[PDB]
Amino acid sequence: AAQTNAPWGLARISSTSPGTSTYYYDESAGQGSCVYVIDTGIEASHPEFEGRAQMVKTYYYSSRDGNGHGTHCAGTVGSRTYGVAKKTQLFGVKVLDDNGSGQYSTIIAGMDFVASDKNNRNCPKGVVASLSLGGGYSSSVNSAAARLQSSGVMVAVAAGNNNADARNYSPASEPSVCTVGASDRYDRRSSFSNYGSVLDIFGPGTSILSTWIGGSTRSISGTSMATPHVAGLAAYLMTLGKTTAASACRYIADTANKGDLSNIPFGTVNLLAYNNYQA
């Protein structure tokens, strides 16, 4: 399959040389898998979700996305004109607030929920969980990410936007989950992407077009936008039979493009997410 004139992020992933504008993916497009987006929620009625995105839990007075961030990530994961896994199932877990923030005590509650809510759903091809949120250590948050991973969910989290070593930021520093860094269009590490040895893989994160609230779209940047990219890939590969949730992140890094990125500190992996598609 091939989506022409696509968002560079999607293109860069089904390509081996940057500067290309086509996304080549297997028609299966992640059908049969699930991706819980733990953010500010998803605007589930957005036409791009084709009725495949649904809210599932909230921790605030309302359940809808009145910020946009969450929807934007949910879109990159699996939305018709912008997502990696275009036929996946998206579940919304609102742990953040409309101003973008949220207490660790409840971020944790959110991760514990996906761990068991996954057991009542029908996702034969595996479950992925995207966490485009973070903060700045907490042995408790890391710990929750790990539990989530232990139960059989591929956890993908953001490295952070402080242009610092990710080891001081919690979701990121947990070794068991997949910590995503951000790269920009000229194969350069985004100016703001956290690095370090805890990082696992790099994904498109600067100037990423995606869906927004009010049935709209818009470009924004950050390791936030990179996380759903590999979350999408993780699901895409999982329904394809290539990897299992427990071992996905390792497969993604084993099969990634090596040494194509620049401005990568010594000690940080130089790997870009990549789906290995061949007609």
Binding site: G68, H69, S101, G102, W212, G222, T223
Partner: peptide, 8 residues
Amino acid sequence: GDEQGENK
């Protein structure tokens, strides 16, 4: 909640 659109 990481970053930048109308915002986090």
